Amino acid sequence: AEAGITGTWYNQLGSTFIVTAGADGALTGTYESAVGNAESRYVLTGRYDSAPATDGSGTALGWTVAWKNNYRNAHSATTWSGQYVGGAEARINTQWLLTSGTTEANAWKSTLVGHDTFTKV
Amino acid sequence: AEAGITGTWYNQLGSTFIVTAGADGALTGTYESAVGNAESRYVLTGRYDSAPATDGSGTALGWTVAWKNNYRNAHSATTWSGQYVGGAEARINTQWLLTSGTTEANAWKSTLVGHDTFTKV
Amino acid sequence: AEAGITGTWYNQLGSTFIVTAGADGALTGTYESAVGNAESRYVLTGRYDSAPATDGSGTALGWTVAWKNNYRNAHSATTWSGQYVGGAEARINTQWLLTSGTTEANAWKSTLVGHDTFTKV
Amino acid sequence: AEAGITGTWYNQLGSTFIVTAGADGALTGTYESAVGNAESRYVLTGRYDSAPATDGSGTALGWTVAWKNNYRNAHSATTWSGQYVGGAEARINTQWLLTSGTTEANAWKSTLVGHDTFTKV
Amino acid sequence: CHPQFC
Amino acid sequence: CHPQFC
Amino acid sequence: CHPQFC
Amino acid sequence: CHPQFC
């Protein structure tokens, strides 16, 4: 992982994820939506295993984007949890949870769940 | 939120979460397990909405802990997604996903899901 | 489980769940919403382990309600997955997924996730 | 849906799902694992929307298999929640929760989450 | 507000 | 349609 | 390996 | 038993 994780990743819809994996387990970078505009950019922060197992196990990781920047506030945050799998066609496989700020009466509709695959290509 | 989020939080099992919420949406801190030892401490990083809505909506947030420190590597990472609800008895309500690094054959057992409530008390 | 599962169960919001657990693993019954009207009643069907382990393990179970009856069609279905824990204060602990029929463009907002506890009281 | 849902469905791993969708919203059938043996067969029951919307929305559905039959008891149950999308290449898209019966101490590792796509082909 | 809730 | 999507 | 899988 | 728990 590490230098294999660093770089640009794309999901099946066209979103772009740019990350630097640091030497002691930090992930920092930006998430850019479809349309690809100069801000549908949002800051991301996360963590990964920097000493992963040596058999063929993937590298466990996760990160958060809060959907506020200088142009937009969508009053929500998404966490992605998954693993990096290296080699010839490297990918990152994730499940995600998206939570919106709600009143306590509407709290039953606060969290959506789905899944995403990122490739280098 | 912000200065309401900063401080020490406890879940129903006794885990302790310590966070500083920064002025522009950053969360940094540590997670300490039961037994409470000088390292079952792990680093956390996340993001929150720093300009939340003014009706009674909660503040959307999330964070990641990778379970590696100087004493232990559990080859996994957890993401918590939820919201902060302030006032007289403030709490943070979350759902979590825990992913373990697996081979692709074992990839069906990589992610557990559960939920957690943190209070100040 | 079985005769311990048969009967009336209530969650923290006041919804009422009525089930007969059959001799070979069937669950059949009705779910009634808050307000408690003569139809906010919906049919449920599911399955449980009828030969559970003899140590103190819970009984694994799940069921589905499609939200259509003679008065209302909400074009959605919920599945509950959990376990029955018996004894002095018996309960059923669940996580649920609620999916709405969407177009493929809106398919990112089709499934909500939450959790529920039912008691006899 | 209905007569479009009735029949044989296959996921990406080779599991086979056989369902009859009934006139008033019932799903009944069997799930057969890989290796395809005469019992890795398990009974399923569920529910679907029998009067779905007429725009291009999918048909919301879900079902349960408890993993006990005459040859095996795995002391667990899975619920699938999703929708049927018809037409030239029909598919059913799902997320699933798998719960195992645990003691209350081990209750943190009871539920796994993943996702599945079934086709006719 | 959904029939699971109200 | 949410910024994660559009 | 669970019967859902094998 | 995992460090999130113990």
Side-chain angles (χ1 to χ4, degrees):
Chain A
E2 194 165 336
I5 291 178
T6 290
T8 306
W9 294 93
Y10 310 94
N11 74 0
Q12 304 245 358
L13 298 87
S15 308
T16 311
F17 163 49
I18 292 162
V19 256
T20 295
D24 291 288
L27 253 27
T28 49
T30 62
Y31 190 91
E32 326 199 341
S33 339
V35 185
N37 32 323
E39 222 143 277
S40 42
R41 278 177 213 143
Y42 291 90
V43 171
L44 79 87
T45 198
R47 296 300 288 164
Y48 75 104
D49 180 12
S50 40
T54 40
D55 55 16
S57 276
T59 308
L61 45 78
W63 66 84
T64 307
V65 172
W67 301 105
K68 177 186 168 311
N69 70 15
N70 286 1
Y71 303 81
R72 198 157 172 184
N73 196 342
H75 297 298
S76 51
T78 305
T79 58
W80 290 257
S81 199
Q83 54 178 331
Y84 165 75
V85 185
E89 34 198 273
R91 73 279 174 176
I92 294 176
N93 302 117
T94 63
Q95 281 261 198
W96 50 260
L97 299 161
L98 163 46
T99 308
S100 299
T102 63
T103 63
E104 278 298 298
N106 285 327
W108 66 269
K109 61 201 309 304
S110 59
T111 310
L112 294 160
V113 66
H115 54 85
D116 251 326
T117 295
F118 293 88
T119 54
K120 296 247 83 157
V121 177
Chain B
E2 194 165 336
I5 291 178
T6 290
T8 306
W9 294 93
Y10 310 94
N11 74 0
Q12 304 245 358
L13 298 87
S15 308
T16 311
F17 163 49
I18 292 162
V19 256
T20 295
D24 291 288
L27 253 27
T28 49
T30 62
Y31 190 91
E32 326 199 341
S33 339
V35 185
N37 32 323
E39 222 143 277
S40 42
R41 278 177 213 143
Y42 291 90
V43 171
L44 79 87
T45 198
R47 296 300 288 164
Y48 75 104
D49 180 12
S50 40
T54 40
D55 55 16
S57 276
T59 308
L61 45 78
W63 66 84
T64 307
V65 172
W67 301 105
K68 177 186 168 311
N69 70 15
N70 286 1
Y71 303 81
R72 198 157 172 184
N73 196 342
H75 297 298
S76 51
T78 305
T79 58
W80 290 257
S81 199
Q83 54 178 331
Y84 165 75
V85 185
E89 34 198 273
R91 73 279 174 176
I92 294 176
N93 302 117
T94 63
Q95 281 261 198
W96 50 260
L97 299 161
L98 163 46
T99 308
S100 299
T102 63
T103 63
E104 278 298 298
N106 285 327
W108 66 269
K109 61 201 309 304
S110 59
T111 310
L112 294 160
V113 66
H115 54 85
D116 251 326
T117 295
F118 293 88
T119 54
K120 296 247 83 157
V121 177
Chain C
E2 194 165 336
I5 291 178
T6 290
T8 306
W9 294 93
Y10 310 94
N11 74 0
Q12 304 245 358
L13 298 87
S15 308
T16 311
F17 163 49
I18 292 162
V19 256
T20 295
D24 291 288
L27 253 27
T28 49
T30 62
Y31 190 91
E32 326 199 341
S33 339
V35 185
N37 32 323
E39 222 143 277
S40 42
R41 278 177 213 143
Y42 291 90
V43 171
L44 79 87
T45 198
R47 296 300 288 164
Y48 75 104
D49 180 12
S50 40
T54 40
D55 55 16
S57 276
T59 308
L61 45 78
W63 66 84
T64 307
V65 172
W67 301 105
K68 177 186 168 311
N69 70 15
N70 286 1
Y71 303 81
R72 198 157 172 184
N73 196 342
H75 297 298
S76 51
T78 305
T79 58
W80 290 257
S81 199
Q83 54 178 331
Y84 165 75
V85 185
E89 34 198 273
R91 73 279 174 176
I92 294 176
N93 302 117
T94 63
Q95 281 261 198
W96 50 260
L97 299 161
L98 163 46
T99 308
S100 299
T102 63
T103 63
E104 278 298 298
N106 285 327
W108 66 269
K109 61 201 309 304
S110 59
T111 310
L112 294 160
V113 66
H115 54 85
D116 251 326
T117 295
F118 293 88
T119 54
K120 296 247 83 157
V121 177
Chain D
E2 194 165 336
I5 291 178
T6 290
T8 306
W9 294 93
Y10 310 94
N11 74 0
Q12 304 245 358
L13 298 87
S15 308
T16 311
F17 163 49
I18 292 162
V19 256
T20 295
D24 291 288
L27 253 27
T28 49
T30 62
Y31 190 91
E32 326 199 341
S33 339
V35 185
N37 32 323
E39 222 143 277
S40 42
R41 278 177 213 143
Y42 291 90
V43 171
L44 79 87
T45 198
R47 296 300 288 164
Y48 75 104
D49 180 12
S50 40
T54 40
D55 55 16
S57 276
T59 308
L61 45 78
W63 66 84
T64 307
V65 172
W67 301 105
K68 177 186 168 311
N69 70 15
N70 286 1
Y71 303 81
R72 198 157 172 184
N73 196 342
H75 297 298
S76 51
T78 305
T79 58
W80 290 257
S81 199
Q83 54 178 331
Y84 165 75
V85 185
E89 34 198 273
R91 73 279 174 176
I92 294 176
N93 302 117
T94 63
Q95 281 261 198
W96 50 260
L97 299 161
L98 163 46
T99 308
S100 299
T102 63
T103 63
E104 278 298 298
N106 285 327
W108 66 269
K109 61 201 309 304
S110 59
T111 310
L112 294 160
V113 66
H115 54 85
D116 251 326
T117 295
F118 293 88
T119 54
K120 296 247 83 157
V121 177
Chain E
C1 180
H2 183 278
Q4 192 180 323
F5 302 108
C6 50
Chain F
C1 180
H2 183 278
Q4 192 180 323
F5 302 108
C6 50
Chain G
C1 180
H2 183 278
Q4 192 180 323
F5 302 108
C6 50
Chain H
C1 180
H2 183 278
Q4 192 180 323
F5 302 108
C6 50

mmCIF file of all heavy atoms in Angstrom, chain D residues 33 42 67 72 76 78, chain G:
data_model
loop_
_atom_site.group_PDB
_atom_site.id
_atom_site.type_symbol
_atom_site.label_atom_id
_atom_site.label_comp_id
_atom_site.label_asym_id
_atom_site.label_seq_id
_atom_site.Cartn_x
_atom_site.Cartn_y
_atom_site.Cartn_z
ATOM 1 N N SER D 33 -26.511 -22.811 -2.795
ATOM 2 C CA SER D 33 -25.135 -22.289 -2.769
ATOM 3 C C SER D 33 -24.307 -22.809 -3.962
ATOM 4 O O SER D 33 -24.730 -23.680 -4.755
ATOM 5 C CB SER D 33 -24.473 -22.725 -1.421
ATOM 6 O OG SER D 33 -25.310 -23.082 -0.295
ATOM 7 N N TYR D 42 -31.863 -24.167 0.761
ATOM 8 C CA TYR D 42 -32.415 -23.550 1.942
ATOM 9 C C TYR D 42 -33.681 -22.857 1.464
ATOM 10 O O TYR D 42 -33.723 -22.365 0.332
ATOM 11 C CB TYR D 42 -31.394 -22.575 2.482
ATOM 12 C CG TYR D 42 -30.144 -23.262 3.058
ATOM 13 C CD1 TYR D 42 -29.022 -23.541 2.254
ATOM 14 C CD2 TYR D 42 -30.130 -23.593 4.411
ATOM 15 C CE1 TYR D 42 -27.894 -24.158 2.811
ATOM 16 C CE2 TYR D 42 -29.010 -24.198 4.982
ATOM 17 C CZ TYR D 42 -27.907 -24.469 4.175
ATOM 18 O OH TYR D 42 -26.786 -25.009 4.775
ATOM 19 N N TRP D 67 -30.182 -20.122 7.821
ATOM 20 C CA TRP D 67 -29.260 -21.163 7.343
ATOM 21 C C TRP D 67 -29.310 -22.479 8.172
ATOM 22 O O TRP D 67 -28.338 -22.953 8.818
ATOM 23 C CB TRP D 67 -27.797 -20.558 7.291
ATOM 24 C CG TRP D 67 -27.751 -19.344 6.354
ATOM 25 C CD1 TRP D 67 -27.685 -18.064 6.877
ATOM 26 C CD2 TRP D 67 -27.836 -19.342 4.973
ATOM 27 N NE1 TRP D 67 -27.753 -17.244 5.846
ATOM 28 C CE2 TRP D 67 -27.847 -17.962 4.696
ATOM 29 C CE3 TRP D 67 -27.913 -20.260 3.918
ATOM 30 C CZ2 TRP D 67 -27.935 -17.511 3.374
ATOM 31 C CZ3 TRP D 67 -27.998 -19.805 2.585
ATOM 32 C CH2 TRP D 67 -28.007 -18.426 2.323
ATOM 33 N N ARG D 72 -27.391 -29.336 7.885
ATOM 34 C CA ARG D 72 -26.483 -28.289 8.323
ATOM 35 C C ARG D 72 -27.290 -27.270 9.121
ATOM 36 O O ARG D 72 -28.459 -26.981 8.810
ATOM 37 C CB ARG D 72 -25.794 -27.643 7.095
ATOM 38 C CG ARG D 72 -24.534 -26.870 7.501
ATOM 39 C CD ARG D 72 -23.568 -26.723 6.325
ATOM 40 N NE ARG D 72 -22.462 -25.830 6.658
ATOM 41 C CZ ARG D 72 -21.524 -25.488 5.762
ATOM 42 N NH1 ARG D 72 -21.527 -25.946 4.514
ATOM 43 N NH2 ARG D 72 -20.589 -24.616 6.113
ATOM 44 N N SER D 76 -27.473 -18.750 11.908
ATOM 45 C CA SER D 76 -27.507 -17.438 11.280
ATOM 46 C C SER D 76 -28.691 -17.224 10.308
ATOM 47 O O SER D 76 -29.417 -18.142 9.884
ATOM 48 C CB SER D 76 -26.145 -17.208 10.580
ATOM 49 O OG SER D 76 -25.673 -18.235 9.700
ATOM 50 N N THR D 78 -29.836 -14.463 6.840
ATOM 51 C CA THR D 78 -29.577 -13.301 6.003
ATOM 52 C C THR D 78 -30.897 -12.691 5.478
ATOM 53 O O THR D 78 -31.830 -13.411 5.112
ATOM 54 C CB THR D 78 -28.601 -13.767 4.849
ATOM 55 O OG1 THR D 78 -27.420 -14.383 5.408
ATOM 56 C CG2 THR D 78 -28.245 -12.597 3.985
ATOM 57 N N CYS G 1 -16.221 -21.076 6.007
ATOM 58 C CA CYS G 1 -16.964 -20.577 4.870
ATOM 59 C C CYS G 1 -18.423 -21.048 4.888
ATOM 60 O O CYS G 1 -18.785 -22.236 5.001
ATOM 61 C CB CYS G 1 -16.272 -21.011 3.598
ATOM 62 S SG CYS G 1 -17.182 -20.388 2.171
ATOM 63 N N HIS G 2 -19.218 -19.969 4.879
ATOM 64 C CA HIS G 2 -20.632 -19.994 5.219
ATOM 65 C C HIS G 2 -21.459 -20.546 4.090
ATOM 66 O O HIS G 2 -21.092 -20.215 2.955
ATOM 67 C CB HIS G 2 -21.015 -18.555 5.564
ATOM 68 C CG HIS G 2 -22.450 -18.351 6.024
ATOM 69 N ND1 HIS G 2 -23.428 -18.252 5.127
ATOM 70 C CD2 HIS G 2 -22.857 -18.301 7.326
ATOM 71 C CE1 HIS G 2 -24.489 -18.129 5.908
ATOM 72 N NE2 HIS G 2 -24.154 -18.163 7.194
ATOM 73 N N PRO G 3 -22.596 -21.237 4.300
ATOM 74 C CA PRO G 3 -23.413 -21.732 3.217
ATOM 75 C C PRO G 3 -23.951 -20.694 2.226
ATOM 76 O O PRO G 3 -24.321 -21.033 1.097
ATOM 77 C CB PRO G 3 -24.481 -22.533 3.962
ATOM 78 C CG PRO G 3 -24.496 -22.133 5.396
ATOM 79 C CD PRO G 3 -23.044 -21.776 5.593
ATOM 80 N N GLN G 4 -24.022 -19.396 2.578
ATOM 81 C CA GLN G 4 -24.378 -18.362 1.600
ATOM 82 C C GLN G 4 -23.339 -18.259 0.483
ATOM 83 O O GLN G 4 -23.639 -17.823 -0.636
ATOM 84 C CB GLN G 4 -24.497 -17.013 2.297
ATOM 85 C CG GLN G 4 -25.152 -15.918 1.448
ATOM 86 C CD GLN G 4 -25.274 -14.582 2.158
ATOM 87 O OE1 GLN G 4 -25.535 -14.563 3.351
ATOM 88 N NE2 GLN G 4 -25.088 -13.400 1.598
ATOM 89 N N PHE G 5 -22.129 -18.698 0.830
ATOM 90 C CA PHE G 5 -20.964 -18.576 0.000
ATOM 91 C C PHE G 5 -20.555 -19.965 -0.556
ATOM 92 O O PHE G 5 -20.331 -20.090 -1.775
ATOM 93 C CB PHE G 5 -19.876 -17.826 0.899
ATOM 94 C CG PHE G 5 -20.425 -16.471 1.367
ATOM 95 C CD1 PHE G 5 -20.795 -16.248 2.710
ATOM 96 C CD2 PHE G 5 -20.668 -15.453 0.435
ATOM 97 C CE1 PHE G 5 -21.401 -15.031 3.104
ATOM 98 C CE2 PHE G 5 -21.276 -14.243 0.853
ATOM 99 C CZ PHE G 5 -21.649 -14.020 2.178
ATOM 100 N N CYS G 6 -20.522 -21.053 0.218
ATOM 101 C CA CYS G 6 -20.042 -22.332 -0.271
ATOM 102 C C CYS G 6 -20.870 -23.483 0.299
ATOM 103 O O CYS G 6 -20.820 -23.819 1.483
ATOM 104 C CB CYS G 6 -18.573 -22.451 0.137
ATOM 105 S SG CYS G 6 -18.304 -22.082 1.911
#
